[PDB]
Nucleic acid binder design. Structure first.
Lengths: 82, 85, 80, 205, 127
RNA sequence: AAUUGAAGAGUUUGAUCAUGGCUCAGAUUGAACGCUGGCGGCAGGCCUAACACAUGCAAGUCGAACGGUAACAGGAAGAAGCUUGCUUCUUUGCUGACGAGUGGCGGACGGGUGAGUAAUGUCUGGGAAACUGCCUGAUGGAGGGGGAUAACUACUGGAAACGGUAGCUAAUACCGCAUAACGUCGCAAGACCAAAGAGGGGGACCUUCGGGCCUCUUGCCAUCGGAUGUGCCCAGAUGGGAUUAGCUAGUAGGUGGGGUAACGGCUCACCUAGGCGACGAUCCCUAGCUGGUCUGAGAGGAUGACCAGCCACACUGGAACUGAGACACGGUCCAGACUCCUACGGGAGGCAGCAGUGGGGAAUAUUGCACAAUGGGCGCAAGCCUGAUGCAGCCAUGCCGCGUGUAUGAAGAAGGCCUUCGGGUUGUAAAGUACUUUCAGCGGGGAGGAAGGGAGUAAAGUUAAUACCUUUGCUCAUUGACGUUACCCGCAGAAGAAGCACCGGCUAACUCCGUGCCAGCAGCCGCGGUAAUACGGAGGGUGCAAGCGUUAAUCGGAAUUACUGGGCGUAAAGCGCACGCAGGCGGUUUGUUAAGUCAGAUGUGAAAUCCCCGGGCUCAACCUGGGAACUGCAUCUGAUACUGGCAA
């Protein structure tokens, strides 16, 4: 079943997560339906850090997808930065 | 073997012996239905049909004989008896 | 207009059945000449009475026994 | 990395100084300038077409202070760029941090400039940079740092800094020890000194 | 067997010492290579009435292999000379059987026995 | 912003021009060997025996489904020695729990491997006669009963593994009945199929004072849907060989019965006699494939470890069960090979999981640390488990960064080497002087990866209930495996840190001495028979650098199998000559169709990745945003010159 989850493709002691909608029975780097955002741990003073299309995610959640606990916190953080 | 799945080993056997007994009764009744169909007594065929319908759906709800197989059985065994009748 | 193709018969006796040769023209990738490739398909057809040289319209279907997953639709003219 | 040998042996082999000394003496006196680079070296000026290509390659590498693998990396990088490949080659060679330090005159020689970038004295846009092969870009302020600025090392440089070349592809201060890189070096700044139309050819031999 | 183990600071340094000691074993290799030629002129046998025996030996214990091999070279006469080629430690292996297949010798092992990759050579040529 | 991309040389002759092979300069590698090696970053690291394996670990989890005390941690009562109010010791499920056990779900995922496998597979594009755990939206039920049985007790066989006999006992386990359309089967009338409770707290009624009963949460069941997942079918493409040319009995088709979740020769019975085959069947040899990687100017070629998708396999061979899902890598049974233990009677095992070992081979690593983070399994949560993963160890293997000092310094020191013995060179190099101290060495300081979760509060929603619980805020305790982290500051003093190949022509860079067609060098043509620029040694020189060289390997150069892009009079090459079927190609005029072809549009062409434009890691490598590419394909709508079809 579909889960929204963070996949780890960053560097050694310097992660870079890719939030993605994918099946449960497939590995962390395995098959997924489409990309939906990204998360740099070092957001800093540059004008982007956390980005995630909510119109895709609320659509997949409405069709029944569950949200991993980090992404669930990040959705209620990232808002309009409100 | 090595790990604690000796529990799952005894679990499948007991359920097998349970399911096999119901499947055995299911098949012996379906052959004694098909006996009447081969015999050509249309009333004894319909009486035996009226015997199998609860039992075939009851196993279908238990699920071991399985749903769409059970429906295809009631359809198929209908088609011979309602030529005979 | 839902998918359909067109070919020729070359089919003997075979109840509810016809075999159907479909010719097409394909470029060889290296040399670029166009050579006619022949895709022979077994076909279902109740009331089987197409002639050997007859040219037949064809469409895809469910498996109607093995190898027979196509079905005829129209036939143009009668060969002999 | 670095050469670590007699500086004048390169200058006699290459056929002019690389500015590896002060300029008080030794472009005409201590040097034996082009007289002979080694013991039998009096007796030949003849050379092949491969050798004139390699000699200018060696001249450019021995000017800028870089090894063949690193210099090949600059040639490959100049190749993907739009605009002239030879011009972007010489731009990548000129674009070094230790080279801008040499242009500002903060280090008297290119080796002293590299020593000065190595020893943690240099700041670019308020970052410190130890890496010699840092590249200086448009609108990069550049400086020697405040903490232990203008020691006897830098101070000795500043005298011959006053009157040599001082061109316009850097803005030069040398009062508070800084500079600003506005315009890029361009073709007319550094051509004809090097056979650049030749040097760009040579890797396809 | 019969010599010193010492604990050490670091693993990396005890590669470097071991590779120096391998250099020392190569010094003992070149010593044993030089000695045989200058003792009697010849590579092996001086006189024309030549006979030898070769053996291939593996003892289970490494202290034993070095001691009893010396006692098998002790008993020899001049006319028939007996010599060890390729002393092993532990079980018989593919390459051990291969040496006595290459050059004829008797293949013996003390409490040592054959293994599968030796058996593969032995079933082919039963040395 | 996205088309800046392609070199030749040496060598057959006395000499020349051709043809034509051979050879080299290039780039590249999961590399080895040789010699030498300071520090750091990042990436990568058994391609040999699908050969066998010691020892440890690799998935279990719910007491909120259930008997229970086997735990052991408290409490209480009581029985008792007193400390005289408390300690002590027997009971006790009272209570935080919780082994063995019962039941449910997980064990079918991930991970490892390339043996078999040339298409049944894979890839692309389409399709129809199908199912699909958990997970969500919708509409409604959740009634009433019953019988066992393991565990556990009492006996009893065993060396051990592992059991036997007889009773007792619960459940969201098991089984009846009621109840049932919009569901299944039927033309319809009709027939028939489900249930399970558990948990928190609380006024009222009352209770055999256990709770009844209310209210909230959650689970159970049926059905119509979702998205997902998987099975199925068809077309085209996807190794080599004609010294493999004939191949097929369930074979090919039909009907009917039976079978699967479902189409179906799927399987029977019966009927008919076909099917495939030069567009390469069949057989054999050989091989996991693709997105891609590597090379290449492009076209092409080679290659498919890394990374991801898919497929296949799990000591050898075969079958089925359980279950939603397996014909099941650490499940079961049986058969086989083989290995071990043993009291010898009888029992036990499958590291191509992670470590690690024997063996193999030129050759590929530590019997490490942690659930801190990400993602999983179970659970309501806590929590527990996680050899996935995050990290570390080892290796100059590759890529990349940096250092091994800087400036001055002529008497151009001595020595070495050459020397027409006039001098020249090694060599501003050294020496000396004046300076700097990166990175190491040493002593001090210190991000981020940590968001959450837990506990306490408040609001809001909820409810008969200020309850009580969740949601949504607030507040306080906290949560770092790596870790002596990244990174920063202070100190001493040039101190600790350069080697390797090559120098006849090719090919950048030259003399002397020794040896004397010997010894040896050689990638190629070749050097040496006393004055060797080609051997050995030295001096000198050049290239390249913590690597260097050799070797093996692939493409290149090679327009040297020639599509782009070749020849065939005499150099290799036109069948001895002819007729001829299959095949290729076809004069000229008109109409028509629109297949090929050409245009347009939509969908699709996984992502990583390459390219183009950017950002961020102290800078690069590396990481990362966005675009382009996505070179193709299919369907649909168009165009009608050309070719094809059709008509005259």
């Amino acid at each position: 079943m579909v889960t929204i989850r963070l996949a780890r493709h960053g560097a050694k002691k310097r992660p870079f997560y890719q939030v993605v909608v994918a099946d449960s029975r497939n590995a962390r780097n395995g098959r997924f339906i489409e990309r939906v955002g990204f998360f740099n741990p070092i957001a800093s003073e540059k004008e982007e850090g956390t980005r995630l299309d909510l119109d895709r995610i609320a659509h997949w959640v409405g069709q029944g997808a569950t949200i991993s606990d980090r992404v669930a916190a990040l959705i209620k953080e990232v808002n309009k930065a409100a | 073997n090595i790990k604690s799945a000796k529990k799952r080993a005894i679990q499948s056997e007991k359920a097998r012996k349970h399911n096999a007994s119901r499947r055995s009764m299911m098949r012996t009744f379906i052959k004694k239905v098909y006996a009447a169909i081969e015999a050509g007594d249309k009333a004894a065929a319909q009486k035996a049909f009226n015997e199998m319908q609860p039992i075939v759906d009851r196993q279908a709800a238990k699920g071991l004989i399985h749903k769409n197989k059970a429906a295809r059985h009631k359809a198929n065994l209908t088609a011979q008896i309602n030529k005979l009748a | 207009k839902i998918r359909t193709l067109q070919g020729r018969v070359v089919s003997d006796k075979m109840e509810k059945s016809i075999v159907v040769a479909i010719e097409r023209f394909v470029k060889h990738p290296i040399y670029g000449k166009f050579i006619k490739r022949t895709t022979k398909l077994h076909v279902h057809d109740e009331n089987n009475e197409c002639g050997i040289g007859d040219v037949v319209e064809i469409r895809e279907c469910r498996p109607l026994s093995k190898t027979k997953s196509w079905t005829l639709v129209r036939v143009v003219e009668k060969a002999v | 990395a670095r050469y670590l040998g007699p500086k004048l042996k390169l200058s006699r082999r290459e056929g002019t100084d690389l500015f590896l000394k002060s300029g008080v003496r030794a472009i005409d006196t201590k040097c034996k300038i082009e007289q002979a680079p080694g013991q039998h070296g009096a007796r030949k000026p003849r050379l092949s077409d491969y050798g004139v290509q390699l000699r200018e390659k060696q001249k450019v590498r021995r000017i800028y202070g870089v090894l063949e693998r690193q210099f090949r990396n600059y040639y490959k990088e100049a190749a993907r760029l739009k605009g002239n490949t030879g011009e972007n080659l010489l731009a990548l060679l000129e674009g070094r941090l230790d080279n801008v330090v040499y242009r500002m005159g903060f280090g008297a020689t290119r080796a002293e400039a590299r020593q000065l970038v190595s020893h943690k004295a240099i700041m670019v846009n308020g970052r410190v940079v130890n890496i010699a092969s840092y590249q200086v870009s448009p609108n990069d302020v550049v400086s020697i740092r405040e903490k232990a600025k203008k020691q006897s090392r830098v101070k000795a440089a500043l005298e011959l800094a006053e009157q040599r070349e001082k061109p316009t592809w850097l803005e030069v201060d040398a009062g508070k020890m800084e500079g600003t890189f506005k315009r890029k070096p361009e073709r007319s700044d550094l051509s004809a000194d090097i056979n650049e139309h030749l040097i760009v050819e040579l890797y396809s031999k | 067997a019969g010599d010193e183990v010492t604990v050490v600071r670091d693993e990396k340094k005890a590669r470097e010492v071991a590779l120096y000691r391998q250099g020392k074993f190569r010094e003992v290799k070149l010593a044993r290579q030089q000695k045989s030629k200058l003792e009697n002129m010849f590579a092996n046998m001086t006189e024309g009435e030549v006979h030898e025996v070769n053996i291939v030996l593996k003892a289970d214990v490494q202290g034993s292999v070095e001691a009893i091999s010396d006692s098998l070279l002790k008993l020899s006469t001049d006319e028939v000379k007996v010599k060890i080629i390729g002393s092993g430690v532990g079980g018989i292996t593919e390459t051990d059987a291969t040496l006595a297949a290459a050059s004829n010798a008797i293949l013996v092992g003390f409490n040592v026995r054959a293994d599968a990759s030796a058996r593969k050579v032995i079933e082919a040529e039963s040395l």
